[PDB]
Amino acid sequence: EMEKEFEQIDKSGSWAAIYQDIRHEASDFPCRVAKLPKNKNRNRYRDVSPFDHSRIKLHQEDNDYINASLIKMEEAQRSYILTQGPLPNTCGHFWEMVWEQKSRGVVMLNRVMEKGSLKCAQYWPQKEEKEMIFEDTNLKLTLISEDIKSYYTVRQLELENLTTQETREILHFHYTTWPDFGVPESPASFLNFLFKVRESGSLSPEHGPVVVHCSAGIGRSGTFCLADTCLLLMDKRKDPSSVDIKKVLLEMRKFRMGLIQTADQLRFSYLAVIEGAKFIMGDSSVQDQWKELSHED
Ligand SMILES: CNC(=O)[C@@H]1Cc2ccc(NS(=O)(=O)O)cc2CN1C(=O)CCc1cccc(C(=O)O)c1
Ligand SMILES: [Cl-]
Numbered sequence: 457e458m459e460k461e462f463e464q465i466d467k468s469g470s471w472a473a474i475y476q477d478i479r480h481e482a483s484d485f486p487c488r489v490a491k492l493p494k495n496k497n498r499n500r501y502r503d504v505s506p507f508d509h510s511r512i513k514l515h516q517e518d519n520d521y522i523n524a525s526l527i528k529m530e531e532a533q534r535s536y537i538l539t540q541g542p543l544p545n546t547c548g549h550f551w552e553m554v555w556e557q558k559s560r561g562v563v564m565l566n567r568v569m570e571k572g573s574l575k576c577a578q579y580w581p582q583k584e585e586k587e588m589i590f591e592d593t594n595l596k597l598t599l600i601s602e603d604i605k606s607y608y609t610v611r612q613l614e615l616e617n618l619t620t621q622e623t624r625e626i627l628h629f630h631y632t633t634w635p636d637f638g639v640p641e642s643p644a645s646f647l648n649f650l651f652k653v654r655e656s657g658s659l660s661p662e663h664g665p666v667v668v669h670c671s672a673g674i675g676r677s678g679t680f681c682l683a684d685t686c687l688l689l690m691d692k693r694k695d696p697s698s699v700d701i702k703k704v705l706l707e708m709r710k711f712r713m714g715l716i717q718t719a720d721q722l723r724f725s726y727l728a729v730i731e732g733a734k735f736i737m738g739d740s741s742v743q744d745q746w747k748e749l750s751h752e753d
């Protein structure tokens with residue numbers, strides 16, 4: 457049971473060992489498409505690639521490759537697309553994927569500039585009056601509005617398929633204070649943000665999978681998805697004791713490599729799930745408390 461395990465790992469100081477056993481046990485599947493010469497400039501990092509079996513294929517129209525994976529959680533009945541931060545030449549591909557996969561929400565857990573370097577392209581418009589046209593994939597993207605909080609921003613975007621003139625509203629949930637290879641400020645800050653994504657309807661099974669990304673699309677993105685899936689599993693069953701967090705992470709790692717990149721991110725995931733369980737099991741009042749503790753205003 458997660459809280460008993462947490463306390464035992466903490467008391468024995470064994471987060472590093474627990475985390476390394478996950479790394480050891482994790483699936484290794486081929487990434488031959490990602491490694492084709494023609495795809496080199498579509499990958500941000502040499503050592504982060506989608507497995508062939510779970511990669512998202514683009515439907516246009518000479519190279520179907522994007523560095524993105526479908527994390528299909530069968531038991532939880534929820535799917536996520538995890539992807540790297542788009543590159544200057546892959547922003548059209550990114551929005552093509554969003555369109556084709558019928559995603560309603562994009563969750564971004566990094567900043568464009570981190571530690572002096574460009575870790576993600578500026579792939580969405582910052583001003584209403586300066587829309588973006590992706591000529592390669594025939595899409596237009598307009599900023600409709602934004603709600604700027606202290607450590608996250610929610611944007612309403614309009615994505616238009618220029619070939620058909622169909623438009624869709626996309627919600628962008630941007631966590632602006634989650635350091636690379638780091639953790640959120642508190643369980644409260646994290647959960648307040650997760651619940652904002654959930655409240656939007658973006659995770660509904662009536663939509664395509666939410667797109668979640670950071671820079672590599674594995675460390676921060678993996679932490680987010682693990683917490684969400686574990687909370688969903690216990691919610692479906694109304695049984696916190698039924699959820700085996702390490703098993704869930706190993707299952708997710710069947711679909712994309714390297715999910716959760718530090719031992720402290722794993723530790724944080726446990727803290728987030730244990731805290732979120734209070735809400736799932738009927739203490740409604742905790743949600744307001746998280747909002748207060750997150751100092752979002
Ligand atoms: C310190 N690592 C790096 O800077 C690069 C590039 C990079 C950048 C930023 C990262 N953080 S993220 O995913 O944006 O939150 C993660 C990584 C992962 N990296 C990797 O090389 C991943 C290698 C890897 C690949 C697959 C599995 C594992 C694992 O043992 O968990 C590790
Ligand atoms: Cl940014």
Ligand SMILES: [Cl-]
Pocket residue numbers: 569570571572573
């Ligand atoms: Cl910086």
Ligand SMILES: [Cl-]
Pocket residue numbers: 542543544574575576577
């Ligand atoms: Cl970039």
Ligand SMILES: [Cl-]
Pocket residue numbers: 570571634635636
């Ligand atoms: Cl950072």
Ligand SMILES: [Mg+2]
Pocket residue numbers: 583584
């Ligand atoms: Mg203005």
